Amino acid sequence: TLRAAVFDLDGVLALPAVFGVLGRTEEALALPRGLLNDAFQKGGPEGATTRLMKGEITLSQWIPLMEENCRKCSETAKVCLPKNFSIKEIFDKAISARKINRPMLQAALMLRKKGFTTAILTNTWLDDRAERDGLAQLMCELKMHFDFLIESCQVGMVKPEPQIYKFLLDTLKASPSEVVFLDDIGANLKPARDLGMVTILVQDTDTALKELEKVTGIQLLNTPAPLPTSCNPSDMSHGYVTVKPRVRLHFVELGSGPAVCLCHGFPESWYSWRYQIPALAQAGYRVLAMDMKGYGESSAPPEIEEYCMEVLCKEMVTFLDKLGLSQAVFIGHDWGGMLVWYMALFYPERVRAVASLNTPFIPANPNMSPLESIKANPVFDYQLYFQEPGVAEAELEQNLSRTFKSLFRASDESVLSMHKVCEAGGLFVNSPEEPSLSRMVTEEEIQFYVQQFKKSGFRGPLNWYRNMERNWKWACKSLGRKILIPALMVTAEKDFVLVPQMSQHMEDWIPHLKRGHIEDCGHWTQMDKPTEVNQILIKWLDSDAR
Amino acid sequence: TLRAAVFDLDGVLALPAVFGVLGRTEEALALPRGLLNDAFQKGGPEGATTRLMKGEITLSQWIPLMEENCRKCSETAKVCLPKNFSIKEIFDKAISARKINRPMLQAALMLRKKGFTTAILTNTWLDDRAERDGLAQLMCELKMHFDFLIESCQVGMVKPEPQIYKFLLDTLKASPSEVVFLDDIGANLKPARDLGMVTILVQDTDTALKELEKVTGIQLLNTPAPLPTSCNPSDMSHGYVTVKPRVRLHFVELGSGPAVCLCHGFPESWYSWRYQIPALAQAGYRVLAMDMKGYGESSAPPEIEEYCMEVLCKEMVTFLDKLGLSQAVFIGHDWGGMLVWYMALFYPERVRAVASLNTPFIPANPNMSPLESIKANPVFDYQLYFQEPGVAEAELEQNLSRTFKSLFRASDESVLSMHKVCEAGGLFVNSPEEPSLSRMVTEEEIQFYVQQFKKSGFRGPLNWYRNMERNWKWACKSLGRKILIPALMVTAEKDFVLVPQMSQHMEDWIPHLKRGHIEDCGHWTQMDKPTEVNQILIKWLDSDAR
Numbered sequence A, B: 001t002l003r004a005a006v007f008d009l010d011g012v013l014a015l016p017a018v019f020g021v022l023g024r025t026e027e028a029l030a031l032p033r034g035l036l037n038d039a040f041q042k043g044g045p046e047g048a049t050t051r052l053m054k055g056e057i058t059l060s061q062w063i064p065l066m067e068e069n070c071r072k073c074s075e076t077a078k079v080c081l082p083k084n085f086s087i088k089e090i091f092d093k094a095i096s097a098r099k100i101n102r103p104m105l106q107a108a109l110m111l112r113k114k115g116f117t118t119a120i121l122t123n124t125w126l127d128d129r130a131e132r133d134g135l136a137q138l139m140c141e142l143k144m145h146f147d148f149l150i151e152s153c154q155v156g157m158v159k160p161e162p163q164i165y166k167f168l169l170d171t172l173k174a175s176p177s178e179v180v181f182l183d184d185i186g187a188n189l190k191p192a193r194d195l196g197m198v199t200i201l202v203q204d205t206d207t208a209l210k211e212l213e214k215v216t217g218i219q220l221l222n223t224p225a226p227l228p229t230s231c232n233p234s235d236m237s238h239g240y241v242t243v244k245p246r247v248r249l250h251f252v253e254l255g256s257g258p259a260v261c262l263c264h265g266f267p268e269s270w271y272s273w274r275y276q277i278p279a280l281a282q283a284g285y286r287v288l289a290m291d292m293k294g295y296g297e298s299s300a301p302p303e304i305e306e307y308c309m310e311v312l313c314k315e316m317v318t319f320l321d322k323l324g325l326s327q328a329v330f331i332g333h334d335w336g337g338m339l340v341w342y343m344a345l346f347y348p349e350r351v352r353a354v355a356s357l358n359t360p361f362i363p364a365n366p367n368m369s370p371l372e373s374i375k376a377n378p379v380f381d382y383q384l385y386f387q388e389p390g391v392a393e394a395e396l397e398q399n400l401s402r403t404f405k406s407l408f409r410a411s412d413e414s415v416l417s418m419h420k421v422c423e424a425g426g427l428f429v430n431s432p433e434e435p436s437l438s439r440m441v442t443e444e445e446i447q448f449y450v451q452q453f454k455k456s457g458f459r460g461p462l463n464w465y466r467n468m469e470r471n472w473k474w475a476c477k478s479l480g481r482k483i484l485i486p487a488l489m490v491t492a493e494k495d496f497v498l499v500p501q502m503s504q505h506m507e508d509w510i511p512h513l514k515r516g517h518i519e520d521c522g523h524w525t526q527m528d529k530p531t532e533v534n535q536i537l538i539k540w541l542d543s544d545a546r
């Protein structure tokens, strides 16, 4: 019968409770017990605090009124408030110290994953303090995970008034018996109970979650570590820049701070960074997740030479110019990782820092043709298969769902055996018509890639491999250079195409190179090990990129 | 015969010349005259500096080589270099001190305006220093104003090599006699002259521009103050956010730094901010120029209530949520100015600072109907004309070019007389069928507005005026509040609709309100006085918004 879960903010989704700081202050300043809490609730439904919680006045208008109540209370109690007593200081510190209650958020996230409608119902204020951004940032992080956020100061009603509960029920489109309501204030829980809602008085989080698990029949405690937050394509800001007459680049954009340009590989999408986008934005960065040239909503001209590294890099520099960005940190994976090393070598003034997942930096051999190197290693046979225009396109485009389900597999999921691809006559000749779904992806996520690839197919993406000679000639111009800007190389233990050992000599050309290494990780780094990718990238960004 | 102008960077488009710092350093450290300049050019075409200028090595690889040449030169000269002599420090300071030569840039801008192809040809380096962003920012500001930027380190050729001149001519698609080439180095001018180009040796800017004016036949010196840089719609980054199922918001985005959300008025576009967008981005802000709901590429649902302030504000808060922005500075003009005051009153935690052009903040009268106030003032008669759905739409949509040419007029250009609009039967009844073009706009800029309005017409825009009662009821909830966040009110002397005196009591509700005032400025503030709007906004942003 239960299908909705409602959470309070202070003392439930965020700890320590801002309210509990009035008690801590009394103790720290040796004031009479309850003095501050009494001045706070002074006047009850007609008092200054209710006016604040209903949105009649702002927090900065409330501060002097709370101070006057504090003076009145101290007078009656026959005590003196200290020399430099400040309600502003006390509240600034309390609000700043209040952080998200991670296990409570995890429980809300699990209930919503299981089909519950979730909401935050809170008695809050209109915050106009100079330091208001901290609270704004917290409310943003929290709210994205819920169906509804109901704030007393916006609705002009306050808990425990019965009208706010009828408003919640109307917002939820649910009858009281269908709702679990969690609150740390027993008085605010009473009208929900009186209406017939399941109520949980929250003291310690663990007990509250045990009651929540018992009543919902859903495992919320001791659960496995969840995946980082992903992206819903229709909820993102989509950006479009024309870099030249027939070429436009599409990107997804989230967050504020230093620009972080994410560059996917083959045959991928901006969506390959879905687990990184929210995390990097939350870490204090402005994420620009590209659809590389030839992919998704970006233009896909047919000509091979439109996909040589020199032109791709020139376009990424134009992309920055048109957005008015002097620099970006460039993070690439696979072919994207190759491009980012080239951006660092040719346009260091535009590259704040550079990081590559899997793709090593190997200097060009000015004596050997690049095709000779590919022929020497049996693992790179698929690249010769990719050479003849039309051959790989026909195979990869034949059945899109089959293509992505065969490609996107974890290291233990029987990934494509790429030896003798040319001899066999294709990539999927020993592959099932209907592959099983990898643990890394949902059916819906595969259908997103299928839909994206319906627009342009595989011509542009395969063209990235068709400029060996052109790329070699351009790379030779960089032979006397070193990469001296901040650089990170992330190796994936079980990537059998871009093996960790291929990166071993990078320090000869990148002396200050920093590294990351991910164990039990295949080629599809971002979706294989998203938590670890996020951990490595955020740590390096905060230390080396600002 | 002349149709192309080529400019050097160091000593021509940027001053003081980075090269002249070697001489200043010798003088300041009392080193033998020419010692540093000699170590700099040591080895000539085979030396370290040519390798740097050709892109063989980066600036950070060059620094130790220059230091070794400095040691060799001092040895031969029988002198000692000082205790803490640093080539890095010297160059960091020289590059940072180098600023754009504004009169040279103005001359290039005028020549391009008159149909010249313009280019920058420069001997430069691959900058990987920790402080490289300063130079990146300068190159970005400069390059946008030119057809081509040719950098020695990217082309692998250097002035005075004849190949770079043949490459320039091929890039320009011009014969030498058609080209003016300006350089501060006589040796680098010689091959252009030998090819038959018009050459100008640049010492002082004034003399160089007198020679340039004489040879081109174009007034470049003593010219009137130019307009700020505008926007070419096809060169901007275009962003799109779905705020709810049937509503998407479009915006143009430029720059990095604190988010600045520009909100246009009626019946306008993001393009109404064209002179502000480049200037604010250059000032160190991330500009988000909206197409407000009902306009341009943003959705335009037909329902009146979709355009009440409460819903418009809720959507702008959702817009911030989806972009991952905790706050933005909100700057509005006209109806946009009305919305920004409402954002400050209802969502102060999301508003970094608020500024309005022309639109005052007038608290709601809880005793009088908003329609009663409009009827009391004859100037607001056009608002009653705007009430009946369909009437104003038919008149404004009849001839789009006529609508915008009649509307967009400076204070001295016989703007619409809005008295007895209802009695007359319309806005344009006493207006010509073919209005003259205002000095504020080009024919092309009018056709941009015409094209934008072809999509949705005037229904959504007029609906902003159709929520008087709803807006009044919502505004009454804010009657006990004050705006205590940073606020700027900009009045326009000759706006006869939004008169400066209408803002006179704003300090009663916004005690710390800052002001700007623009004389001889009509209603269309941004295009009437763009230089002054930019000056007022940048000054206030830098002082009050970060």
Ligand SMILES: COc1ccc(NC(=O)Nc2cccc(-c3ncn(C[C@@H]4CCCO4)c3-c3nc4c(N)ncnc4s3)c2)cc1
Pocket: A266, A267, A334, A335, A338, A359, A360, A361, A362, A363, A364, A373, A374, A380, A382, A407, A416, A427, A471, A472, A475, A497, A498
């Ligand atoms: C079947 O589905 C797939 C999907 C993705 C891939 N991934 C790739 O093919 N990744 C990729 C991306 C970019 C370059 C390479 C690559 N594969 C082989 N080499 C050859 C080098 C040369 C000597 C040692 O290995 C390179 C590289 N190309 C370059 C280059 N052009 N410049 C610099 N370093 C390298 S490494 C691979 C493979 C199969």
Ligand SMILES: COc1ccc(NC(=O)Nc2cccc(-c3ncn(C[C@@H]4CCCO4)c3-c3nc4c(N)ncnc4s3)c2)cc1
Pocket: B266, B267, B334, B335, B338, B359, B360, B361, B362, B363, B364, B373, B374, B380, B382, B407, B416, B427, B471, B472, B475, B497, B498
């Ligand atoms: C014919 O082409 C045009 C193009 C643009 C305009 N511009 C406007 O109509 N601007 C505009 C925008 C927003 C509000 C108003 C406005 N016009 C009259 N009042 C009435 C006030 C009330 C008492 C004194 O004047 C208001 C305002 N509406 C509000 C509101 N709803 N809330 C708060 N303050 C105001 S001022 C005007 C006019 C003709």
